[PDB]
C-alpha cells in the first residue's frame, strides 16, 4: 500500500476526487522505493526523485512532466507543514534534460515531438542531422547512405520535391522523400567546422574540436587523422553516444531512431484509418522506400514494433487516450 501512510492520508484528505485518483497510484508505486530508503518522498534527494519517476516506467516526456508536477505539489505541502527535513522543493530543481532521465527503461522509441524537443537542446548540427536523418530513414548497411551523404545531394533534393538520392555501399541508389527541416539541418551539418563537446557544457579543458573540411554532411574530427573522405561507422555511434550522454538515456541507437520514424508514420495512418495491419505496414515500406529482401518478409519483421499496442503506448496523448 503506502509508506508513511498516516501522513500520506493526511495529504490525500485535502484533495479533489480527481487528484486523489491521480495521487493514490503514485504513492502505491512509490512505496517500494520509500521503504527501500526508509523515508518519504518529501525527504528524497533530487537523484532519488529521478529514480523514483523511472520506477513508474513511463514512456513519454509528456507523462514524466505531469508526474513531476504532481510530486512538486505534494512536496510544497510537506514543506508548509515542516515534515520535510529540507527547506526547499527538490522536484522544482529538476532540469529539462533531466526529464529524459526519468523515462522508464521499457522505452525504446522516441515520438516526433520528443525528436523535435531533443533537437532544440542539441547545439551541434552534426548531432541534429544524424538524429533527424536517421529518423527520416537515411541509413543503409553500416549507415552507408548517411556517411556517403553530400551537400550536393542535399541541394539537389531541395530542388527535386525533397527527394534525396542516396548511395548504399552494398546495393544501388535509392530515392527517399524527406522533410524540408531535414534538408536544411543537413545543409548546415555539411558546413560545420567546429563540434562542441558534451553538447556545449564541456568542463574546462578543450571545449570544442575541429572537424575535417569536406562536402560530406557527416564529418570526422581532425584529430582522428582519417583525411577528408567519408566518415566511418563509428562516427555515427559516437554522435549518438554524445546525444545519449547529455540526456542520460540508454535506449537510443541508430536502429531505434530509424524505427521511431516508421512508428510516427504508423501513428499518422492509424489516426485516420483506426487499425494497424499488414496494409499499413506495406504503406510504410513504400513511404520510406524501404530497402528490403522482400516486402512480405519486411512486413513480418515490422509486427514486433508497427502495431496498435506500441502506437497506443507512445502516442496516447496525440490519439486522445487516457
Amino acid at each position: 500500500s503506502m509508506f508513511n501512510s498516516e501522513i500520506k492520508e493526511k495529504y490525500l484528505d485535502t484533495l479533489s476526487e480527481g487528484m486523489v485518483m491521480q495521487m493514490r497510484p503514485i504513492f502505491a508505486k512509490a512505496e517500494i522505493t520509500e521503504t527501500l530508503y526508509n523515508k518519504d518522498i518529501y525527504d528524497f534527494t533530487s537523484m532519488q526523485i529521478l529514480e523514483l519517476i523511472r520506477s513508474f516506467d513511463q514512456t513519454t516526456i509528456g507523462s514524466v512532466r505531469r508526474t513531476l508536477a504532481l510530486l512538486s505539489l505534494y512536496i510544497d505541502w510537506a514543506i508548509s507543514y515542516k515534515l520535510s527535513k529540507g527547506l526547499t522543493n527538490l522536484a522544482r530543481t529538476i532540469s529539462e534534460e533531466e526529464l529524459y532521465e526519468c523515462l522508464g527503461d521499457k522505452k525504446l522509441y522516441i515520438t516526433y515531438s520528443e525528436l523535435e524537443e531533443m533537437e532544440n537542446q542539441l547545439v551541434n548540427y552534426q548531432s541534429k542531422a544524424v538524429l533527424r536523418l536517421l529518423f527520416e530513414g537515411v541509413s543503409g548497411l553500416a549507415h552507408s547512405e548517411l556517411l556517403s551523404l553530400t551537400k550536393k545531394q542535399v541541394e539537389d533534393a531541395m530542388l527535386n520535391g525533397n527527394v534525396l538520392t542516396l548511395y548504399d555501399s552494398k546495393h544501388g541508389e535509392r530515392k527517399l522523400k524527406v522533410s524540408s527541416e531535414c534538408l536544411v539541418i543537413a545543409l548546415n551539418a555539411a558546413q560545420e567546422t567546429k563540434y562542441k563537446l558534451k553538447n556545449g557544457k564541456a568542463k574546462g579543458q578543450t571545449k570544442e574540436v575541429f572537424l575535417v573540411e569536406n562536402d560530406y554532411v557527416v564529418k570526422t574530427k581532425r584529430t582522428s587523422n582519417k583525411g577528408d573522405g567519408q566518415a566511418s561507422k563509428f562516427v555515427i555511434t559516437n554522435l549518438i553516444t554524445d546525444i545519449s550522454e547529455f540526456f542520460k538515456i540508454n535506449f537510443l541507437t541508430p536502429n531505434t531512431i530509424v524505427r521511431s520514424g516508421h512508428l510516427y508514420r504508423a501513428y499518422q495512418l492509424y489516426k485516420e484509418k483506426g487499425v494497424i495491419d499488414n496494409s499499413v505496414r506495406y504503406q510504410i515500406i513504400d513511404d520510406f522506400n524501404l530497402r528490403v529482401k522482400s516486402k512480405y518478409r519486411a512486413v513480418y519483421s515490422m509486427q514486433d514494433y508497427i502495431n496498435e499496442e506500441e502506437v497506443n503506448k507512445y502516442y496516447a496523448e496525440e490519439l486522445g487516450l487516457k
Side-chain angles (χ1 to χ4, degrees), residues 1-321:
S1 184
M2 293 190 290
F3 180 90
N4 198 33
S5 53
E6 299 212 358
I7 289 162
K8 296 290 204 306
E9 245 93 35
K10 252 270 201 172
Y11 174 62
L12 288 162
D13 192 44
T14 68
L15 298 169
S16 78
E17 318 88 302
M19 284 300 291
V20 170
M21 282 276 281
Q22 300 195 257
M23 291 314 304
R24 223 137 194 147
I26 286 156
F27 300 140
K29 293 127 109 112
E31 204 261 8
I32 144 85
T33 310
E34 293 178 293
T35 70
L36 176 68
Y37 300 122
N38 196 25
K39 62 178 188 174
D40 194 291
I41 286 158
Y42 58 64
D43 279 354
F44 275 25
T45 66
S46 286
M47 286 198 75
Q48 287 165 351
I49 284 169
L50 300 179
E51 177 192 307
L52 181 65
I53 307 267
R54 207 156 48 242
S55 86
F56 307 160
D57 222 328
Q58 288 176 247
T59 298
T60 67
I61 278 289
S63 81
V64 158
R65 187 179 283 140
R66 294 193 298 277
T67 295
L68 192 65
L70 294 174
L71 294 164
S72 309
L73 283 37
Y74 170 62
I75 293 162
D76 292 334
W77 181 82
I79 291 170
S80 293
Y81 280 47
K82 313 191 203 313
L83 298 161
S84 185
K85 275 228 270 64
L87 303 177
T88 60
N89 185 335
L90 273 35
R92 192 135 281 147
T93 69
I94 303 308
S95 62
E96 194 187 342
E97 321 99 85
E98 278 170 334
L99 289 163
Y100 289 83
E101 206 175 342
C102 300
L103 293 162
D105 67 338
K106 305 284 134 286
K107 180 176 184 71
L108 277 175
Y109 309 113
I110 56 169
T111 63
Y112 187 73
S113 77
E114 290 166 344
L115 178 68
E116 284 184 298
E117 259 177 49
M118 290 166 78
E119 269 176 358
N120 271 118
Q121 299 168 256
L122 291 175
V123 304
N124 302 295
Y125 277 101
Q126 290 287 302
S127 305
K128 294 184 200 287
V130 169
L131 186 64
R132 188 163 271 270
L133 284 160
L134 288 164
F135 186 94
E136 293 204 48
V138 180
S139 48
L141 206 159
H143 315 308
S144 62
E145 297 178 321
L146 187 51
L147 300 165
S148 72
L149 189 66
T150 63
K151 259 236 294 155
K152 165 159 195 297
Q153 293 162 275
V154 172
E155 290 171 325
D156 288 0
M158 292 193 183
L159 304 177
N160 222 255
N162 283 8
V163 185
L164 269 172
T165 268
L166 299 171
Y167 309 139
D168 191 274
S169 55
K170 179 79 189 190
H171 314 118
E173 277 183 345
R174 180 168 85 90
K175 302 196 181 158
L176 183 65
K177 196 203 177 135
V178 295
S179 80
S180 298
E181 185 64 18
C182 186
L183 297 176
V184 175
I185 286 169
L187 192 64
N188 286 270
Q191 282 158 285
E192 183 179 349
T193 60
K194 314 308 304 293
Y195 175 87
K196 316 189 194 213
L197 269 46
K198 293 192 188 276
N199 195 52
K201 278 158 60 261
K203 289 302 184 56
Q205 301 296 82
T206 66
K207 278 142 191 138
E208 321 203 326
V209 298
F210 277 91
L211 295 165
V212 144
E213 267 210 307
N214 54 24
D215 282 279
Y216 293 108
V217 351
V218 187
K219 296 187 190 297
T220 54
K221 290 156 189 168
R222 283 192 192 281
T223 57
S224 294
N225 304 343
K226 301 270 168 160
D228 302 356
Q230 294 184 25
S232 81
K233 251 174 25 162
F234 294 110
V235 182
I236 305 310
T237 317
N238 291 338
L239 293 173
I240 299 309
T241 302
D242 290 0
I243 290 166
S244 299
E245 229 98 297
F246 180 67
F247 297 109
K248 286 148 251 156
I249 55 183
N250 306 296
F251 63 84
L252 214 67
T253 83
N255 197 62
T256 250
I257 298 156
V258 169
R259 288 189 158 195
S260 296
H262 301 162
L263 190 72
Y264 184 46
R265 185 49 180 159
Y267 152 78
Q268 289 179 330
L269 297 162
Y270 177 65
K271 194 180 208 300
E272 310 306 298
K273 168 163 187 60
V275 52
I276 295 174
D277 61 358
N278 283 340
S279 76
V280 170
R281 296 172 192 109
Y282 279 112
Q283 195 170 358
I284 293 171
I285 289 158
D286 278 19
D287 293 341
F288 288 86
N289 189 24
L290 206 60
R291 205 176 273 290
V292 302
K293 291 204 295 284
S294 62
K295 296 188 184 165
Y296 78 85
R297 294 259 272 107
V299 164
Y300 175 67
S301 318
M302 288 179 44
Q303 279 146 33
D304 292 315
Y305 73 103
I306 303 306
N307 56 59
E308 294 168 20
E309 74 164 324
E310 299 287 306
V311 171
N312 292 324
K313 165 155 75 211
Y314 291 91
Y315 285 93
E317 172 141 300
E318 293 95 332
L319 288 164
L321 307 175

